[PDB]
Copies of this chain bind each other. A is one copy, B any other.
């Protein structure tokens, strides 16, 4: 905080975009990355204070499940200080 990251992965782009907007609506988080690794998987990564990050991912997960298919939801309170040099989480 404010370096905590929230992670949402859906099966479908529309569920992911819906979740993304729901996440930034619900808390003061910043979208820092989007990953599409195939087989329908789309991942949206947000950063901010750990409290806001959890609020974001909770709202994002609910929206993803309603719009399409939620695959994963996760929070990393303190990412490794050098993680952001290999994965976009800043």
Contact = CB atoms under 8 A, between A and B. Distances in A.
Contacts of A44: 86-87
B84 A31 contact: yes
A45 interface: yes
Interface string A29-69: 01111111111111111000000000000000000000110
A1 interface: no
Contacts of A84: 30-31
B79 A13 contact: no
Contacts of A5: 17
A41 B13 CA distance: 8
B43 A14 contact: yes
